[PDB]
Design a binder for this molecule. Structure first.
Ligand SMILES: [Cl-]
Ligand SMILES: [Cl-]
Ligand SMILES: [Cl-]
Ligand SMILES: [Cl-]
Ligand SMILES: [Cl-]
Ligand SMILES: [Cl-]
Lengths: 117, 117
């Protein structure tokens, strides 16, 4: 599975097999899944972040119109398929990434994919 | 495949599917393979490091009796299966890892497996 691929939500244990970070959020922004690659990139513990809020608890630098604001618009409208660059920084070393956020096929969850730039 | 597993060299595209860093070295310490997870952990570019020396070029903090010295003894003797903690630092943010070094099944290459502590 390639980062950014048009069919990524269709294709999506095995989550840890992805070569890039993958976080599954619900519409409230709480973490349902968080793979090994995302812990590799950020130093956050995949076990500790499940059930926490991505935008308000785990990665508060993302609580901005440029990231959380896009997520909330996407959840409200059902239209979410966006790539952009961002810097993660909270309680970690500042790390520049490329982010792809996309609504899941079910419409009940939302994916955040991450790779280092 | 679990980090540290007794049969890891037997089990070892697919390399990027591993949930932890994996580097294949030859007996001279030059890099033959370097997976996505190791780039995720360190910020080093998996494309750029192939054919470079791990101990002298890519990760010179490892040029120590505690890491390179164990590698050289392992290559010389054929006996290499060791776990230890280490900090990577060269041209990156200091990152504490657990390392497992093990001779490959063929005896012509040597694996370095890495996870964040
Ligand atoms: Cl809010
Ligand atoms: Cl952050
Ligand atoms: Cl994260
Ligand atoms: Cl280093
Ligand atoms: Cl490395
Ligand atoms: Cl030397």
């Amino acid at each position: 599975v390639a980062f950014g691929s048009e069919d990524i939500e269709n294709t999506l244990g095995q989550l840890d097999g992805l070569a890039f970070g993958a976080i599954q959020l619900d519409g409230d922004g709480n973490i349902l899944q968080y793979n090994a690659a995302e812990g590799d990139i950020t130093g956050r513990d995949p076990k500790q972040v499940i059930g926490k809020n991505f935008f308000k608890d785990v990665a508060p630098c993302t609580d901005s119109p440029e990231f959380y604001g896009k997520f909330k618009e996407g959840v409200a409208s059902g239209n979410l398929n966006t790539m952009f660059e961002y810097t993660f920084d909270y309680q970690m070393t500042p790390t520049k990434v490329k982010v792809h956020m996309k609504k899941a096929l079910s419409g009940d969850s939302y994916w955040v994919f991450v790779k280092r730039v």
